[PDB]
Design a protein around this motif. Structure first.
Motif, PDB file in Angstrom:
ATOM      1  N   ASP A 136      -7.029   6.409  -5.850  1.00  0.00           N
ATOM      2  CA  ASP A 136      -6.247   6.888  -4.824  1.00  0.00           C
ATOM      3  C   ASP A 136      -4.730   6.352  -4.527  1.00  0.00           C
ATOM      4  O   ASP A 136      -4.198   5.907  -3.635  1.00  0.00           O
ATOM      5  N   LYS A 137      -4.053   6.246  -5.770  1.00  0.00           N
ATOM      6  CA  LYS A 137      -2.988   5.247  -5.693  1.00  0.00           C
ATOM      7  C   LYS A 137      -1.579   6.171  -5.686  1.00  0.00           C
ATOM      8  O   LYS A 137      -1.492   7.375  -5.932  1.00  0.00           O
ATOM      9  N   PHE A 138      -0.400   5.478  -5.713  1.00  0.00           N
ATOM     10  CA  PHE A 138       0.704   6.268  -5.508  1.00  0.00           C
ATOM     11  C   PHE A 138       1.789   5.107  -5.852  1.00  0.00           C
ATOM     12  O   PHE A 138       1.635   3.859  -6.133  1.00  0.00           O
ATOM     13  N   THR A 139       3.095   5.444  -6.127  1.00  0.00           N
ATOM     14  CA  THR A 139       4.230   4.756  -6.836  1.00  0.00           C
ATOM     15  C   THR A 139       5.250   4.711  -5.661  1.00  0.00           C
ATOM     16  O   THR A 139       5.913   5.264  -5.247  1.00  0.00           O
ATOM     17  N   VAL A 140       5.562   3.341  -5.609  1.00  0.00           N
ATOM     18  CA  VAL A 140       6.656   2.571  -4.735  1.00  0.00           C
ATOM     19  C   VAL A 140       7.596   2.092  -5.772  1.00  0.00           C
ATOM     20  O   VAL A 140       7.328   1.512  -6.764  1.00  0.00           O
ATOM     21  N   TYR A 146      -6.756  -7.932  -1.258  1.00  0.00           N
ATOM     22  CA  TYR A 146      -7.452  -6.719  -1.782  1.00  0.00           C
ATOM     23  C   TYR A 146      -6.708  -5.288  -1.658  1.00  0.00           C
ATOM     24  O   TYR A 146      -7.183  -4.181  -1.765  1.00  0.00           O
ATOM     25  N   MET A 205      -0.125  -2.371   4.020  1.00  0.00           N
ATOM     26  CA  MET A 205       0.833  -2.993   3.051  1.00  0.00           C
ATOM     27  C   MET A 205       1.798  -2.620   3.803  1.00  0.00           C
ATOM     28  O   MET A 205       2.089  -1.723   4.449  1.00  0.00           O
ATOM     29  N   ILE A 206       3.022  -3.519   3.326  1.00  0.00           N
ATOM     30  CA  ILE A 206       4.352  -3.192   4.228  1.00  0.00           C
ATOM     31  C   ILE A 206       5.485  -3.129   2.955  1.00  0.00           C
ATOM     32  O   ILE A 206       5.303  -3.800   2.135  1.00  0.00           O
ATOM     33  N   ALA A 226      -3.679   2.303  -1.088  1.00  0.00           N
ATOM     34  CA  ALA A 226      -3.750   2.089   0.245  1.00  0.00           C
ATOM     35  C   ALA A 226      -5.234   1.796   0.595  1.00  0.00           C
ATOM     36  O   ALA A 226      -5.797   1.079   1.286  1.00  0.00           O
ATOM     37  N   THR A 227      -6.038   2.717   0.042  1.00  0.00           N
ATOM     38  CA  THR A 227      -7.543   2.654   0.194  1.00  0.00           C
ATOM     39  C   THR A 227      -8.308   1.395  -0.509  1.00  0.00           C
ATOM     40  O   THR A 227      -7.917   0.935  -1.547  1.00  0.00           O
ATOM     41  N   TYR A 228      -9.272   0.976   0.189  1.00  0.00           N
ATOM     42  CA  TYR A 228     -10.013  -0.307  -0.238  1.00  0.00           C
ATOM     43  C   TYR A 228     -10.731  -0.234  -1.256  1.00  0.00           C
ATOM     44  O   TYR A 228     -11.731   0.657  -1.392  1.00  0.00           O
ATOM     45  N   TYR A 282      -1.485  -7.288   1.023  1.00  0.00           N
ATOM     46  CA  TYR A 282      -2.565  -8.231   1.775  1.00  0.00           C
ATOM     47  C   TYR A 282      -3.880  -8.426   0.880  1.00  0.00           C
ATOM     48  O   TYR A 282      -3.796  -7.607  -0.216  1.00  0.00           O
TER      49      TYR A 282
END
Ligand SMILES: [Cu+2]
Ligand SMILES: [Cu+2]
Lengths: 150, 140
Positions: free
Chosen positions: B102-106, B119, B1-2, B77-79, B117
């Protein structure tokens, strides 16, 4: 900046070739057994691997670099990296350290925190601020790649 | 991810070309004046502009850009484990589940963009004007 995982079977979609080749190369290694220290990969690319301790954010300075990109990957443990995606205010940064290719700043504007698990990797291009190793001990590696290779 | 910003002088570095061309294009517009709803960019690309569970896509990537306000987006970020997902909606190209593993916050600020992208699980709009450009991964 790019955040992703070596373990995702599609992580190469979108990635600059040079970064794809280093990740394909890291997936060949016994990452667990990698010795602490510097490891050369190319004439151009090396990496440092280490077992630092996560330290509280206000105890350390963020950094950014001019000549190299970082590919950081976490191997063991869990790690927070504060990051900023907006261009930093350079007027607020310490003097550029030319031998280690970096400048420091007490803080990141519009910062947010990336939480890193094993096999996750982050790419920070030049002038992308990051304060890795934030809040307990971990194993990680960072690959240093000249941006002119992008 | 960008994750970058449209207003960073270096944002194109390492960016897939099609995404750089869309960002250039957004940079060409008064984004705050943009009408809510669907705008078509190309024959293959379009974007939704709006004033407001996790989702992922198969054929499209998202470029999500924040125009006004500030929004938290939860990402993985993990699949993903594709079993814990509800059935694939083909018409609209998305799959839903309640949580990202496994998530985080932007935290998006005006003019930041995020590329997700196929998935890459994301859950936008967490405690504004924004848009999300839709572009077929094939073009990557
Ligand atoms: Cu660095
Ligand atoms: Cu989406």
């Amino acid at each position: 900046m790019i955040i992703s995982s070596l373990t995702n079977p599609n992580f190469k979609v979108g990635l600059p070739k040079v970064i794809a080749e280093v990740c394909d190369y890291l997936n060949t290694l016994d990452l667990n057994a990698l010795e602490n220290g510097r490891h050369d990969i190319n004439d151009q690319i090396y990496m440092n691997v280490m077992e630092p301790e996560t330290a509280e954010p206000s105890s350390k300075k963020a950094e950014l670099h001019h000549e190299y990109l970082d590919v950081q990957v976490l191997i063991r443990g869990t790690e927070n990296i504060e990051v900023g995606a907006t261009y930093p205010n350079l007027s607020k940064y310490e003097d550029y350290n030319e031998a280690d290719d970096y400048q420091l700043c007490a803080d990141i504007d519009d910062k947010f925190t990336v939480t890193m698990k094993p096999k996750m990797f982050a790419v920070f291009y030049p002038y992308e601020p990051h304060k890795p190793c934030c809040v307990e001990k971990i194993k990680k590696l960072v690959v240093k790649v000249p941006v002119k290779l992008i």
